[PDB]
Amino acid sequence: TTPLEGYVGIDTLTEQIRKKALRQGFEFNVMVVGSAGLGKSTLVNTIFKSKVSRRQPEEDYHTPSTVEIKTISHVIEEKGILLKLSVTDTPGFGDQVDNTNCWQPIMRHVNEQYEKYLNEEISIKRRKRIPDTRVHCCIYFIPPSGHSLRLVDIEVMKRLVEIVNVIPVIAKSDSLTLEERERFKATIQQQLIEHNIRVYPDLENLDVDDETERQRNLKLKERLPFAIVGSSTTHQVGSKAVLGRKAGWGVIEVENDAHCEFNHLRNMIIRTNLQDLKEVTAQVHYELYRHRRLETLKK
Amino acid sequence: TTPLEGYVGIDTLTEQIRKKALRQGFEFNVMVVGSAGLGKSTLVNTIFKSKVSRRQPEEDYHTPSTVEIKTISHVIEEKGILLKLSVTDTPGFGDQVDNTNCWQPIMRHVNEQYEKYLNEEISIKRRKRIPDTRVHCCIYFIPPSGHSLRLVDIEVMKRLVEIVNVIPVIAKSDSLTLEERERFKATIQQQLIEHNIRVYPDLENLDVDDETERQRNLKLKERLPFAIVGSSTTHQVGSKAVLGRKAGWGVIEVENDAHCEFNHLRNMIIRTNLQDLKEVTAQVHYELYRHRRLETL
Amino acid sequence: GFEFTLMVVGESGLGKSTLINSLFLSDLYTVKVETTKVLIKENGVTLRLTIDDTPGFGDAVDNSNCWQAVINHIEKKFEDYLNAESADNRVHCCLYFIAPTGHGLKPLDVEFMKNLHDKVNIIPLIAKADTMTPEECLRFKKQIMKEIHEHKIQLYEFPECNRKLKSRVPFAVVGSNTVLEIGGRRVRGRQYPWGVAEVENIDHCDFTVLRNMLVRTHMQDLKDVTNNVHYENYRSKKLSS
Amino acid sequence: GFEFTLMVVGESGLGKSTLINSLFLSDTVKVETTKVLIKENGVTLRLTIDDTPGFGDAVDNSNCWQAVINHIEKKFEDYLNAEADNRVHCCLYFIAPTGHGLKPLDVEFMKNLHDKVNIIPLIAKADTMTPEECLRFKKQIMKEIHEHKIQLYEFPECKLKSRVPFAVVGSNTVLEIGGRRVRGRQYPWGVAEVENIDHCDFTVLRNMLVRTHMQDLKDVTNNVHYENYRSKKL
Ligand SMILES: Nc1nc2c(ncn2[C@@H]2O[C@H](COP(=O)(O)OP(=O)(O)O)[C@@H](O)[C@H]2O)c(=O)[nH]1
Ligand SMILES: Nc1nc2c(ncn2[C@@H]2O[C@H](COP(=O)(O)OP(=O)(O)O)[C@@H](O)[C@H]2O)c(=O)[nH]1
Ligand SMILES: Nc1nc2c(ncn2[C@@H]2O[C@H](COP(=O)(O)OP(=O)(O)O)[C@@H](O)[C@H]2O)c(=O)[nH]1
Ligand SMILES: Nc1nc2c(ncn2[C@@H]2O[C@H](COP(=O)(O)OP(=O)(O)O)[C@@H](O)[C@H]2O)c(=O)[nH]1
């Protein structure tokens, strides 16, 4: 490095980038995948603390004859930061009598977004800034069976860990005691190792020169899958209002670490690994899709 | 558009981005274009307050028989931020008996950087992060004649403004009195309008909606071309150790706004419009280069 | 002694075994049918009880025609009884477990109850009621009943002896095997960091209603309807054909 | 009275007109001739000033010094045919204050013209340089002149010769500083004085050209440069 003899002003550079962001807004695409009735819409509304799901939990739901993929778009503002958020859900996944090819529409959706981006990129008359419809996060909901993963879950996770970031969560964790939750987590982790399902955060995608990030992400992986509880209703406990669920024997607290693990999931999605998810999507998954497709479109 | 009901945490995003730049650092490329003996090396040393230029201003210099392009690279540390700085000088420019087609090496250098970026982008085995060697700024040095632009200067600026961000500066402005400085700036601006030379900042490359940033760039445009003075020797004036030049009749202070417009240039390059220069290079000049080649191929 | 046959149908991990242990207070514990015989000596009268579990139900990626095994089992028992006419091992009750989802009947449940409602008495139970709030439980019950009445499914209607208890169909059950000490009180329940969900509590789950109706109040009407309706109809075609 | 002629050559925008007005206190490349009658100090001087406009101005300066040579040859031919001294006696070349050395155009001009007219190198706009910078530039310029074997006009009799090439500052404006009237240039940091030996070398040049050593220029023109042309012609 060349030593400096005064103040130059490179430190201001970050602020400049910040200012540019204020005029555009960051794009985030979440996709929830799981069987109907596991709390996907409620969890999306709990993470973003707004009615951002396509179907509100109150409205009636009918299982369609086919597996559909539905998307909804929103703009969320906080302290000058705009988030263009696209939440995509899978009505009819894992509910039919015959669930074969239930993961096909999901992968078709992800690959079609990649295709849109690559076609906008290759064109001669290209835009200055390419809109990003690529799925940045995929949250997979595991029913709280307490025994092991279902076969459909294993199949879909194996297919999906290859084209999109997947973060497993035990849906409706309020139904498991602490011992049961621990045993279920141990079984789920052993099964993930056995089937070699490498979920986000993949430590292979992190640089070796950085150790603090490696240890932090190792702790995050050691915590997975997350025992989550989602709810958009607040209740008075003690002398404070807490988001939670009310049953005759108590109230499950969403924001209490000793009750659930929603805190860790929301911290990773929003506060600690959002940009890492976007970077892995744009530098590991889209890059591999682009390589594979162009190695076929050589001519 | 969608009301919230608590702390989701989206505001943390900026901090996250910072932690991801902190490890990789930013990269900037400046190109100084002018004849010999106009303070280019001293100005580059003064902007970054370090011995960054290829040639130290006090060593030696012999005029090359051809216009050559030379590049130096450095890593600059500033409160945790790494800047990969490239400085490109053009020895031999505007100093020959015959200066016909003396803009070819400069345009060739810029187009070569555009070629490198495009050929790495189209490549199927593409790298995750393409190193940007493209020329982000072009500081053009005009000698302090006091009459008008040289024809060799008009030609090169006219060719350069179509592909590169050009920022005209009046070199060795301490040789100009204020009245002469104002007449020279007025004549240069009139000649730029007459020959249709559009220099950075250009208001056609800005969003229509934004106005508080449009006005600032309009002020910067009206102030061009800057009257700069560069130095690296610290002199004691009164009780202050200030950068400047000690003539036989006074100390010309570089950082003083009443003396020279160096502060405007350094604030525009380093503190206010660095990322705007990079963005305009990547989105206005690189894109026009891309559309021309792909139509050709 | 007394004879009874109870079949358990549902997806895995829905508290089926725990509920079966809880009702009968004993350590009783490819879709086929597994049979377990127990001899329960309680309340004076001795019951030789049969449990027909159907393991592997709903645990496959493709579940087409997975209800043929239970149909075959019921009809095989029917034929064995008909031949023996010239011990009542007929499957008298069938507990179907519906996942606590909160939306309505899945297509698999609809198909099972559409192709089994004229073979065996179907008692729909909402498995794991301790994961629903009361409002969700009522909404789910209403939606399930509406879809049952829409598809013309004939479930089992309990007879007159609890008026507000027999109208709680489909039942929402909670099962536990661990005895906890709540203020010196020996209670069966599940302990969460937020409280104790008690099995025998009438405000928590319908376990007591089901225990009373099935174990010791209406265990004979099930046999009677099996003999006089389902078995009679089954003979009404095989002999006719 | 006394006839003399001075030819000013240099790039446009270098204080040539200002320096001419300061020395004599009066207000395509084609040589432009002007005639002035200056009755300074009682001696009438008929001064012919030949400016070279367009020198070093166009993008192509190839053989732009031919007009200068053709001008001197034509004056030499006119005198020989007559045999009014219209021969170009002095030529002042202005070197831009680059701080490095001589440009190719300067070298070419002083190569082609140093055997046809007396050449006095001047560093135009001497206020551009700190004293150390000016001394270094002078040393490099003299080294390069000796490498190119360029012969300049040395001054007879009348410490001041060591200042060659002269660093000159020209200014037509008189200003009031320290309760005295001085010719100079005004900057926010101070006033650069034309007639201060510690600031520039204008006073030495004026003394040499006007006061003392001018008939010597005429003599060295008649006895060296005019003889060689006539020798080649004959
Ligand atoms: N026990 C429990 N129930 C939940 C939770 N989140 C939602 N529910 C309830 O489950 C039902 C279905 O949830 P919903 O979000 O509509 O499921 P989705 O169809 O998977 O989106 C709703 O009635 C919710 O009130 C949870 O975290 N725990
Ligand atoms: N008048 C003036 N002279 C300068 C300035 N900066 C540098 N110089 C002098 O110019 C001489 C050569 O400048 P240099 O940096 O080598 O210019 P370059 O050859 O074009 O790179 C040095 O002696 C410097 O002291 C300035 O801002 N004004
Ligand atoms: N939430 C809830 N969990 C239960 C209940 N009964 C049993 N479980 C748990 O569910 C898990 C699997 O159910 P299990 O009793 O083995 O019966 P299965 O349905 O035959 O698998 C075990 O951890 C049980 O402890 C209940 O009523 N509510
Ligand atoms: N720094 C400096 N500037 C000068 C000097 N003499 C003249 N100038 C300015 O330079 C400009 C060019 O002067 P001019 O004599 O017209 O140059 P010419 O075209 O070479 O004759 C004018 O604005 C003068 O005021 C000088 O000695 N030093």
From TrEMBL, chain B:
GDP 1 binds at residues 37-42, 55, 174, 230. Belongs to the TRAFAC class TrmE-Era-EngA-EngB-Septin-like GTPase superfamily. Septin GTPase family. Residues 24-296 form the Septin-type G domain. Keywords: Cell cycle, Cell division, GTP-binding, Nucleotide-binding. GO terms for cellular component: cell division site; cleavage apparatus septin structure; microtubule cytoskeleton; septin complex; septin ring. It comes from Ciona intestinalis. One of its GO terms (biological process) is cytoskeleton organization. GDP 2 binds at residues 147, 175, 180, 183. The chain holds residues 2 to 298 of 356 of the full protein. This is Neuronal-specific septin-3. One of its GO terms (molecular function) is GTP binding.
TrEMBL record, chain C:
One of its GO terms (biological process) is cytoskeleton-dependent cytokinesis. It is found in: Chromosome, Centromere, Kinetochore; Cleavage furrow; Cytoplasm, Cytoskeleton, Cilium axoneme; Cytoplasm, Cytoskeleton, Spindle. GO terms for cellular component: axoneme; cell division site; cleavage furrow; kinetochore; microtubule cytoskeleton; midbody; septin complex; septin ring. Keywords: Cell cycle, Cell division, Cell projection, Centromere, Chromosome, Cilium, Coiled coil, Cytoplasm, Cytoskeleton, GTP-binding, Kinetochore, Mitosis, Nucleotide-binding. The keyword Transmembrane helix does not apply. GO terms for molecular function: GTP binding; GTPase activity; molecular adaptor activity. GDP 1 binds at residues 12-18, 103, 128, 130-131, 136, 175, 190. This is Septin. It comes from Ciona intestinalis (Transparent sea squirt). The chain holds residues 40 to 308 of 428 of the full protein.
